[PDB]
Amino acid sequence: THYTRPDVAAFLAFLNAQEGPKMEEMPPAGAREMMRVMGQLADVPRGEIAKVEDRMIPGPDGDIPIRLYDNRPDREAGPVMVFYHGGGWVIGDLETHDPYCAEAARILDMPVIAIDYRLAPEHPFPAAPIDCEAATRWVADNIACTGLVLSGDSAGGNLTIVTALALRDEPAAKPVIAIHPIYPAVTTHNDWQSYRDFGEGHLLTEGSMTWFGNHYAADPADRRAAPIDFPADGLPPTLLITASLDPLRDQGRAYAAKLIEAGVPTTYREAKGTIHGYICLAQGIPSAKDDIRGALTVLKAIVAEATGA
Amino acid sequence: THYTRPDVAAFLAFLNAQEGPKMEEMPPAGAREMMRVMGQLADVPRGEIAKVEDRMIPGPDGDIPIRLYDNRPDREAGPVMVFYHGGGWVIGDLETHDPYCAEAARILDMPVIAIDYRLAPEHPFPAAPIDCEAATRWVADNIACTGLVLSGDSAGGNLTIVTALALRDEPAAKPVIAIHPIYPAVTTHNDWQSYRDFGEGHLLTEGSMTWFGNHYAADPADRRAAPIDFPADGLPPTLLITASLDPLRDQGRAYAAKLIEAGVPTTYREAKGTIHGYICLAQGIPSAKDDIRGALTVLKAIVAEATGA
């Protein structure tokens, strides 16, 4: 068997008992609704936060909606985090990841901008990376900041890495000073021991990954889909976290190892005994709160080191 | 050309203009004196520290001299750092690394115990790793502490990793909670691009390394000489730092990568634009002070997270 935290095993037993269709049997609209209802039941609320503002920004295929979270709006010019939500490029929105964004804004003490990027299958690859890169450049130009911290979970961890590579090659008005990919997808291939071990029973399944991947319809040769296939030299200091029961664990490790081999300062964290998707499950999995807090404390120090030097 | 900090360049200009024999042209006694005099000229002094105590402990072969540094001797039982000096298993002692150990004890706010292990060629491999393991067990059994933090530079980085692998397999009376190998040697072979790039003009030279290697006479197939060839699973949280102009940089990268691939939580830092040996050169290379302080701040947080269990 595999080490599993007791509260994770308890939440898994709950997930395994639910009646009614799997996500992969649903059209996108119904999958999108499943995730909202799961968040309502198993995520914490937003909690208290001084400022949350929505607006539209111009992007190349139309307006991109963003949400700015700031718990200390009187700050001076400092770093800003841009956040790209997960949901396999099909599901997720500004509300599914709202409680995480707010928590991040509170712990990091920096403004957090979440991007509502275009989703498949209505907008297949490469709409998501186009939107994310355009939003991030807009932020560097238009928001008072000294530097960008890019972060995202799962599909959004992918978008974090691909966006950091596009800005490494052609810089924004402000540098990326750090990146925080959370349980990222970095490749489209499934030849991984963690994929054989954990591809059933652990929230993210073989069935649901196939479903995501077919709708997004990514070009597997393109760096925007498969950044483990391309040089990593000159990326900023990276905090990469994986979850030990996650079918994507091993490609996360492999990416972190590639970063170290290219000389990129890297902090690898593994949430031991927990599953993919934990950053939105902090009420159903209470130990998730310490994983969130523990990673963002390390990130806060990484950013403080980059700004003090 | 390779990025080089201006103050490192300036130190190297001075070192390369020195007259008088190279270390490798000397018998061990004369090499040992060169290192003491280099430290005298290019290291910071011990500075203020509440307590420094010298004693002998019983070892497998006789007395092992140790030195205890504590900047807060009143403390409650907490973590203790055991430190293994570098010098290619031939040179170095308690005085060569004294200013670093005091600095660590101040920044980490924990006791630091430096070990004077047996040196080659009078005592070839495996004397040093046996002594280090024996002293570390003595500390766990005899000094009030809750856990051990092992650290060391170069040969001493090797001894840190080897010692942690020995205690992973048969634990001391107290757990290892973190390890901090500083520009470690993890193999005896030289097939590394960094070795071809930086094996002359950067303080640690091909000639030095061969001279150390011949005196130590390590068995290249033994885990105690070549830890990179053996499983890393189940080591504690590791902070591994390399210097970018070091002949040993690439094997250090490769070890940090292997730790990540085994699921060990790992922070990799690279001192960009600096050389091997910088922890003893903080007066001749003033930027070394921020490399020391930067790493020890990270380690201190790693330990704080472990002891909040």
Numbering used by the authors:
A (entry chain B), B (entry chain A): 6 to 314
Question: What did the article's authors report about this structure?
Answer:
Herein, we identified from a library of lipases/esterases/acyltransferases and variants thereof a lipase originating from Sphingomonas sp. HXN-200 (SpL) able to form amides in aqueous solution starting from a broad scope of sterically demanding heteroaromatic ethyl esters as well as aliphatic amines, reaching isolated yields up to 99% on preparative scale and space time yields of up to 864 g L–1 d–1; thus, in selected cases, the amide was formed within minutes. SpL is a hormone-sensitive lipase-like (HSL-like) protein adopting the alpha-beta hydrolase fold, with a helical lid domain over the active site cavity with the catalytic triad. The common Ser-His-Asp catalytic triad was located at positions Ser159, His281, and Asp251. Mutational and structural studies revealed that an aspartate next to the catalytically active serine is highly beneficial for the observed activity, which has not been described before, showing that a catalytic tetrad is actually required (Asp-Ser-His-Asp) for SpL for efficient amide formation in aqueous buffer.
To gain insights into the mechanism of amide formation catalyzed by lipase SpL, its structure was determined by X-ray crystallography. Diffraction data were collected under cryo-conditions from native crystals, as well as from crystals soaked with benzylamine 2a or the amide N-benzyl-2-pyridinecarboxamide 3a,a leading to data sets with resolutions of 2.0, 1.6, and 1.8 Å, respectively. Furthermore, two funnel-shaped channels leading from the surface to the catalytic triad or actually the tetrad were identified. Next to Ser159 of the catalytically active triad, an aspartate (Asp158) caught our attention as it is not present, e.g., in the lipase from C. antarctica B (CalB). The aspartate next to the catalytically active serine may represent an extension of the classical triad Ser-His-Asp/Glu42−44 in the lipase mechanism to a tetrad. Furthermore, the crystal structure showed that the enzyme possesses two access tunnels to the active site, probably one for the ester and one for the amine, another feature not described before. This feature allows for bringing together two sterically demanding substrates, the ester and amine, without interfering with each other.
